[PDB]
Structure 1
Amino acid sequence: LSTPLQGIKVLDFTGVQSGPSCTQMLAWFGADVIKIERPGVGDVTRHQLRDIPDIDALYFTMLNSNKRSIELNTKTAEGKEVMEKLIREADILVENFHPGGFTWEHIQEINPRLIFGSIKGFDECSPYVNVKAYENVAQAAGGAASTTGFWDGPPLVSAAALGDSNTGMHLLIGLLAALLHREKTGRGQRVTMSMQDAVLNLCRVKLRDQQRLDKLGYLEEYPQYPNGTFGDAVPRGGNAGGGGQPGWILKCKGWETDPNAYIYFTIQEQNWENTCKAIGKPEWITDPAYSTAHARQPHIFDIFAEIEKYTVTIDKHEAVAYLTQFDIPCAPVLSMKEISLDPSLRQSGSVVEVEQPLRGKYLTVGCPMKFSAFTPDIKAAPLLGEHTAAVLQELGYSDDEIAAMKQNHAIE
């Protein structure tokens, strides 16, 4: 029908996760994403963590669906000529190389409408500008590790790709905003995004808590209050709510053996009565020590322990089925196994089955947001250099020229 980025052409040099997550979305929105890869090597994800010998790893297929692939040697003269032709026709160019001759200056000269997207570990004026960064390096520098985990444990890394995909989605936002901007200035521009800023942005609430702590010297809703101790910096709070509604991770039947036999339970301020009813503590409705959140805080864990006495008694799924009847905000801790087999996530398009050449079927996370005017069609990832010829043909090169370029490369 129509597609959001229909007609948009993307020059994609990204590798690994952050950059590829961004361009995979661009493709699902309708853009033609051309993955430019080193001849014979390609994106490292192609060979990292393989589950099957000699074929592209799931690391690759799950971050490169709907993309095209060309093998290009930018060093040669042939490659240099192909590169400029690509830049002239492109709408967007994306790269996420480590800190370590088509310059941004020359590129505007060549294509004043081109939007340059760049992902780095740190901002340009950062003292870590030249430091390489991987997922967890960014989580540590961004404030996430420092505030994740337990107060008597070390800083904890998060499973969520706060430093990659998260950074990829942020760049995606910038790219789309730049496309909207170009609609008015008729000009492209440069968009940069660091992994550190991505992490920091998701930790916005922790900077709020840091300021409350600098001012008051304590954080009322944190587990350290009021019998613990507060330092100069926001501490790890275990499985605390993290906002204005207290919560915790409660054990359910089977926890001794099943690492995922748990639920998250939220003590919602306006749902206190229903909560008391759900757990058979009607007396707590009027008891001064429990009728208010402020009054509950000091001994809130005795409340979690009382609720847990019931949860360890049944399967996490019955606990949720029972508790939600009282409008309690809660859910079971779903394992990746449960998620990979959930029917609704299949029906909602969250978990999508894809047929990949040479491999067969694999599962991937689909387009997160849903549109009423368009539905993305998630397809297989490209084999290395699968579209090299097609792209050169589109650039106007003849069959003899294409053959010669491949022959020179073979000889070289």
Structure 2
Amino acid sequence: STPLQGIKVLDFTGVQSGPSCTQMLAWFGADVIKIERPGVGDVTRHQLRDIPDIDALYFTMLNSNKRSIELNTKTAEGKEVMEKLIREADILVENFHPGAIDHMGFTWEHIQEINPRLIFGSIKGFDECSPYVNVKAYENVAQAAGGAASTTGFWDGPPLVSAAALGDSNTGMHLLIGLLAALLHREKTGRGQRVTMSMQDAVLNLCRVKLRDQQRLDKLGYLEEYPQYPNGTFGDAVPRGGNAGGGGQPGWILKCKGWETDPNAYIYFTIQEQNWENTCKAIGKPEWITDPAYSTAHARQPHIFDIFAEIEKYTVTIDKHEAVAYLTQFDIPCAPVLSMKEISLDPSLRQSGSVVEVEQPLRGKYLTVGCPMKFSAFTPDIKAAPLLGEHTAAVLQELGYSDDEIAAMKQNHAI
């Protein structure tokens, strides 16, 4: 068995936020029916193609294990099919621009009459209450609005976006939590419900510790662990802190051998509070262990960049991998800045099922990020992403449509 065996999902989503969510649902065992615009399909099929005329990697990495139907829900037949699908499904997911699904006639209120057991998941850029409620949102728009860009980067540089999908995949993961909770809830109420998740909120959730800092800053007028303390200045808003420890312990990104030509010849190095002695032994500074300018976090802070400068006299003489292999003997929390190339070839990520080679029709092999959490009682089986409308006939037949009904839909551009 799988966790979602028997669950039926209607997947209206496109791009990244919505499809990351329903991809996971499929991996957990749900039957995920991707509803696509006839002749067009999810925009990621044509975005940044690396092989001419076939589905792009953006699409294949987000749509493994799904089924694809072409269905134009703005036709009379399409709306009826859509209604039959809602009637038989457990879950409906959409991440269209605000209004979009409503204007098809498929608003929450109509959905409940058709299927009171259905769980409706909706992703938007912004909440119902927001002044930005009808604003279209892409990844970095949510990063700006959710507090991440404000607090990421350097104090003497611009706001900076994160490479990580804080707005897209992160939001899809947050809706997934809601959908799972809603399934557990339905076990008790006998009812579906609506779950919404905004991109702004998904970003904000991950910046909880910066909202901690803002309150500290409001009360006190300073942040004792930030690079600006005590010889710089604070304004009224949490500032950017470069490569400071954030939610972790004090740390920095340090150069290792190769840095002048290799943009990834670096480590993250943590000065953990209780590990100062080991940290000093590691770098051959036994005289720093009990020196009152060095022995506590509070004393180190005013000259912490001298201390990082001193660790860097060692780290630049060896490869990041050598550097880490040594320092971890001293129980220092550290790790190489791994490039996407190193991650793509890393044997242990293959073994753990974190990076998965999948075979796609026409394309052949590609790599995807696998199911990130591991279960002792089940292993996801990660498969190819569907060709556009590959499963239209089968889905219509499962609903009870005759061959004549299907041929009429095709004639009428409903599929």
Match of 1:136, SS state, is helix
8 Å Cα contact 2:140-2:161 kept in structure 1: yes
Q: Percent sequence identity over matched residues?
A: 100
Q: Does 1:54 align with 2:56?
A: no
Indicate the SS of the match to 1:201. helix
Per the alignment, do residues 410 and 78 of structure 1 end up closer, same or farther by CA in structure 2, a change over 3 Å counting?
closer
Q: Are 2:364 and 1:360 aligned?
A: yes
**1:322 counterpart SS class:** helix
Tell me by how many angstroms 1:106 deviates: 1.6
Deviations 1:131-158 (A, max 9, x none): 1110000000000000000000000000
Q: Deviations over 1:92-134 (max 9, x none)?
A: 0000011252221121111000000000000000000011110
Per-residue deviation, 1:407: 3.0
| Separation (CA, whole Å) in 1 of partners of 2:236 and 2:408 | 66
Instruction: Name the SS for the 2:359 alignment partner.
Output: strand
SS in 2 for 1:410: coil
Deviations 1:2-37 (A, max 9, x none): 010000000110000000000000000000000000
Q: CA offset at residue 276 of structure 1?
A: 0.3
Please report how far the alpha carbon of residue 408 of structure 1 lies from its aligned counterpart in structure 2 after TM superposition.
3.2
Provide Cα deviations, 1:334-393, integer angstroms capped at 9, x if missing partner.
000000000000000000000000100000000000000110000000000000000011
| Cα distance in 2, alignment partners of residues 28 and 243 from structure 1 | 31
Q: Following the alignment from structure 1 to structure 2, what is the Cα–Cα distance between the partners of residues 289 and 245?
A: 18
How far apart, in 2, do the equivalents of 1:334 and 1:52 lie?
A: 27
**Cα distance in 1 for residues equivalent to 2:414 and 2:179:** 37
CA distance in 2: counterparts of 1:105 and 1:229, whole angstroms = 53
Counterpart residue number, 2:381:
377
Deviation at residue 241 of structure 1 after TM alignment: 0.2
Equivalent-residue separation in structure 2 for 1:95 and 1:153 (angstroms): 37
Deviation at 1:405, TM superposition (A): 2.0
Q: Normalized against structure 1, the TM-score is what?
A: 0.98
DSSP 3-state at the match of 1:51: coil
RMSD: 1.1
1:203 alignment counterpart? 207
Which residue is 1:96 aligned to? 95
Q: Residues of 1 paired with 2:413 and 2:140: CA distance?
A: 38
Q: TM-score, normalised by structure 2?
A: 0.98
Query: What's the secondary structure of 1:296's corresponding residue?
Result: helix
Change (3 A) 1:370 1:332: same
Tell me how far apart the structure 2 counterparts of residues 123 and 102 of structure 1 sit (CA, whole Å): 19
State how far apart, in whole Å, the 1-side matches of 2:70 and 2:168 are.
24
Report how far residue 78 of structure 1 moved. Answer: 1.5
CA contact (8 A) 2:154 2:241 kept: yes
Distance 1:244 1:149 in 2: 17
Long gaps (5+) in structure 1: none
What secondary structure is seen at the aligned counterpart in 2 of 1:219? coil
Matches of 2:94 and 2:32, distance apart in 1: 13
8 A contact 2:171–2:199 mirrored in 1: yes
CA distance in 2, matches of 1:410, 1:33: 20
Question: Could you give the per-residue CA deviations for residues 157-176 of structure 1, whole angstroms, max 9, x where no partner exists?
Answer: 00000000000000000000
Shift of 1:404: 2.9
Report which stretch shifted further, 392-401 or 129-138. Answer: 392-401
Q: Following the alignment from structure 1 to structure 2, what is the Cα–Cα distance between the partners of residues 323 and 213?
A: 34
Write the deviation string for residues 27-65 of structure 1: whole angstroms up to 9, x where unpaired.
000000000000000100000010011100000000000
How far residue 410 of structure 1 moved from its aligned partner, in angstroms, is 9.1
3-state SS, counterpart of residue 349 of structure 2? helix
Tell me the residue number matched to 2:344.
340
Q: Displacement of 1:242 after TM fit? A: 0.6
Mapped contact 2:72–2:414 kept (Cα < 8 A):
no
- Tell me the residue number matched to 1:394: 398
Question: Quick one: distance in 2 between partners of 1:291 and 1:81?
Answer: 72
Find the aligned partners of 1:63 and 1:243 in 2 and give their Cα distance.
30
| Greater mean deviation of Cα atoms: 29-38 or 74-83 | 74-83
Displacement of 1:77: 1.7
* Partner deviation per Cα, 1:285-310 (whole Å, 9 max, x = no partner): 11111111111111011000000000
* 1:245 Cα deviation after fit: 1.2
Question: Does the CA contact (< 8 Å) of 2:71 and 2:414 recur in 1?
Answer: no
CA distance in structure 2 between the aligned counterparts of 1:410 and 1:284, rounded to whole angstroms:
75
Do the aligned residues in 1 keep the contact of 2:60 with 2:385 (CA within 8 Å)?
yes
68-77 vs 205-214, which moves further? 68-77
User: For residue 11 of structure 1, what is the aligned residue in structure 2?
Assistant: 10
Q: Would you identify which runs of 4 or more consecutive aligned residues in structure 1 move more than 2 Å? A: 407-411
Q: Distance in 1 between matches of 2:273 and 2:9?
A: 48
Compute the displacement of 1:76 (Å). Answer: 1.7
User: Distance in 1 between the 2:51 and 2:86 partners?
Assistant: 36
The alpha carbon displacement at 1:398 in A equals 1.8
Q: CA deviation at 1:244?
A: 5.4
* Cα distance in structure 2, aligned partners of 1:103 and 1:283: 69
SS at match of 1:235: coil
In structure 2, C-alpha distance between the alignment counterparts of 1:75 and 1:349, rounded to whole Å: 41
Of residues 97-106 and 234-243 in structure 1, the stretch that sits farther from structure 2 once superposed is: 97-106
* Paired residues of 2:77 and 2:414 also in contact (CA < 8 A): no
In the TM superposition, what are the counterparts of 1:289-308 in structure 2 within 5 Å? 289-308=293-312
Gaps in structure 2 of 5+ consecutive residues: 100-104
The structural deviation recorded for 1:75 is: 1.9
